[PDB]
């Protein structure tokens, strides 16, 4: 057997252009005119981008351009937007009723502005406090590039224990979102002055400090 | 769009069978056979394991079976093996131009007890409001297996605009942690009565509500 070749990664500058090559075999690609292209957004419910060599499905992003250059197929993305970061796959009909896929090309847009995160800290709410627990939530958001680190400050001494953070995910953007959580007993929470969520990103640091005077 | 409602997580053990399901909203159903199922491992290209409701392609192990009745196609891994563990998707060809995808699933071969998520909705802290910002967080924590559906609601009606959902992170107890957020204005927040964060894990829904109670 075999599964179509794709170049594992395809960069381009902003507003520019890239072309990915789904490359097959006489028995599949070049056998028939039935190559579709797929946009699989950083691990997501994938969509169809082309169906037959160069036909843009009923509501596609402006200028996905499909090519079949013998047994090499090509998808040309131009007017480069940030949102084109994805997993690009192709599929060609091979024989008896069935389709063959390709390796999988990750598309990379360059020239994306670096953004420093919006740290929103949270005090626990009444309900949680009634239910008898306290969990604090640092929300880091709209950052680029997606490397951030979260310290917790118990009260100006650190609190390594009871913290839990998340790997940054891409938004309907190409900005990331992350969060830390500190799980506390309410007791512990009446019992002392400040809590702090310190977030470092590309040199910057943003600290947010919360105090027990939450209203409800 | 994802008008093919697919479960968030589907899990079993070796030798236990698992149904994935794929529901259509589609004013379509009946006038239909063309429902194709895809087996997709993390790292690999997507590969079809079912075409036209019940036909697997060449080399699909016997255990995969598809069905469709009502508006529901179903895929039964009949006797679960290790690398049945993958992302699964479904499909429907509204002829040519309109290739509707389902939203995905996951096959978890459990080797950890099932953990239904802790939801913990936090409302626009008084400070953030004092900055004329509005954001409520839906912490989803301690869930296994690490796939979960998240949806929001204002005054009953669902909210789509402004919600960003992170990807399940593995925690220092091999259970999972996600977060959504709804970004708003004090206006929109204050101008309502109740906001649910609604979360779906396997065969479970947790809906937690926050009301605007406006201390400053």
């Amino acid at each position: 057997p075999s599964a179509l070749t794709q170049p594992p990664s395809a960069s381009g500058s902003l507003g520019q252009s890239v072309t990915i090559s789904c490359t097959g075999t006489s028995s599949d690609v070049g056998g028939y005119n039935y190559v579709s292209w797929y946009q699989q957004h950083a691990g997501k419910a994938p969509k169809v981008i082309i169906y037959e060599v160069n036909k843009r499905p009923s509501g596609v992003p402006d200028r996905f351009s499909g090519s079949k250059s013998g047994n090499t197929a090509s998808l040309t993305v131009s007017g480069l937007q940030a949102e084109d970061e994805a997993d690009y796959y192709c599929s060609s009909y091979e024989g008896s009723d069935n389709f063959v896929f390709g390796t999988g090309t990750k598309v990379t847009v360059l020239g994306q502005p670096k953004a420093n995160p919006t740290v929103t800290l949270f005090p626990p709410s009444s309900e949680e406090l009634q239910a008898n627990k306290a969990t604090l939530v640092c929300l880091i958001s709209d950052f680029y590039p997606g490397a951030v680190t979260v310290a917790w400050k118990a009260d100006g001494s650190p609190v390594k224990a009871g913290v839990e953070t998340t790997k940054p995910s891409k938004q309907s953007n190409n900005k990331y979102a992350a969060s830390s959580y500190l799980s506390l007993t309410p007791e512990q929470w009446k019992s002392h002055r400040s809590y702090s969520c310190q977030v470092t990103h590309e040199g910057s640091t943003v600290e947010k400090t919360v105090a027990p005077t939450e209203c409800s | 769009p994802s008008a093919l409602t697919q479960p968030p997580s589907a899990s079993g053990s070796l030798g236990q069978s698992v149904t994935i399901s794929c529901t259509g909203t589609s004013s379509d159903v009946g006038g239909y056979n063309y429902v194709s199922w895809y087996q997709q491992h993390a790292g690999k290209a997507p590969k079809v394991i079912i075409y036209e409701v019940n036909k697997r392609p060449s080399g699909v192990p016997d255990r995969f079976s598809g069905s469709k009745s009502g508006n529901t196609a179903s895929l039964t891994v009949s006797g679960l093996q290790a690398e049945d563990e993958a992302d699964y998707y479904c499909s429907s060809y509204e002829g040519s131009d309109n290739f509707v995808f389902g939203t995905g699933t996951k096959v978890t071969v459990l080797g950890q007890p099932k953990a239904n998520p802790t939801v913990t909705l936090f409302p626009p802290s008084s400070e953030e409001l004092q900055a004329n910002k509005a954001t409520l967080v839906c912490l989803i924590s301690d869930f296994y297996p690490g796939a979960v559906t998240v949806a929001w609601k204002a005054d009953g009606s669902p909210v789509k605009a402004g919600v960003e959902t992170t990807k399940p992170s593995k925690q220092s107890n091999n259970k999972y942690a996600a977060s959504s957020y709804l970004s708003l204005t004090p206006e929109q927040w204050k101008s309502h009565r109740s906001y649910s964060c609604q979360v779906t894990h396997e065969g479970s829904t947790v809906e937690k509500t926050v009301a605007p109670t406006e201390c400053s």
Binding site: Y93, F99 | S36, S96
Partner: peptide, 4 residues
Amino acid sequence: QXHX
């Protein structure tokens, strides 16, 4: 993959 629909086609067919």
